[PDB]
Design a protein around this ligand. Structure first.
Ligand SMILES: CCCn1c(=O)ccc2c(-c3cnc(-c4cccnc4)s3)n[nH]c21
Ligand SMILES: [Cl-]
Ligand SMILES: [Mg+2]
Ligand SMILES: [Mg+2]
Ligand SMILES: [Mg+2]
Ligand SMILES: [Mg+2]
Length: 193
């Protein structure tokens, strides 16, 4: 009850003053979206679980981030009455500032999916398949109502920071791929010691 209401208010707050939360709604804040998600994958690597992160720029400037960590948990979270992944993602600034966001969790030999719009879940978390892997996939589309100047990512910007993050976080393989033009796909992959 109260907990879920807290959530909605939090989404409203973020969408009303997005620059207070991500610095700006310029091109810089657009790329900050990617940094927020990649930092979560880095934390799961530092915790000992993940070692591979992939960032894909998809057609129409969707971003897909994939890690091979444990998978965000799906167990019903005691204070919300809702799956843990739903709590974590409805408290995410990226989700609030995305027109659409999808999660796929590989965990417990199961693939779970949920989708969101401006942070609001579109359906309850569902089992959609099976798996013998663990990890988490998040795909999002930046909200052009927030990012009013541009929602087009800059590969070089992405590449320079990804390269830095792999250099700083030795052992994690981090891959960037641009699939926006299916006729000319570019990938860079970084892996320091
Ligand atoms: C591309 C997805 C990036 N990403 C996020 O944006 C947010 C959370 C996480 C996690 C986990 C958090 N907590 C875990 C957890 C904790 C305890 C037990 N099992 C998993 S996994 N992994 N990746 C993430
Ligand atoms: Cl779980
Ligand atoms: Mg954060
Ligand atoms: Mg974080
Ligand atoms: Mg953290
Ligand atoms: Mg079903």
């Amino acid at each position: 009850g109260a907990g879920q209401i807290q959530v909605l208010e939090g989404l409203e707050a973020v969408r009303k003053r997005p620059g207070m939360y991500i610095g700006s709604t310029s091109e810089r804040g657009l790329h900050h979206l990617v940094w927020e998600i990649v930092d979560n994958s880095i934390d799961e690597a530092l915790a000992g679980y993940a070692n591979q992160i992939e960032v894909v720029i998809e057609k129409d400037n969707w971003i897909k981030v994939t890690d091979n960590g444990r998978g965000i948990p799906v167990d019903i979270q005691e204070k919300m009455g809702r799956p843990a992944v739903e709590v974590i993602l409805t408290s995410s600034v990226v989700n609030a500032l995305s027109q659409d966001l999808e999660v796929y969790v590989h965990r417990n030999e199961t693939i779970y999916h949920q989708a969101y719009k401006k942070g609001v879940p579109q359906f309850d978390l569902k089992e959609v398949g099976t798996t013998d892997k663990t990890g988490t996939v998040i795909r999002f589309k930046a909200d052009g109502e927030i990012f009013t100047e541009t929602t087009v990512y800059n590969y070089e910007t992405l590449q320079q920071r990804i390269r830095e993050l792999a250099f700083l976080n030795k052992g994690i393989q981090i891959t960037l791929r641009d699939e926006r033009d299916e006729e000319n796909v570019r990938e860079d992959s970084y892996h320091y010691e």
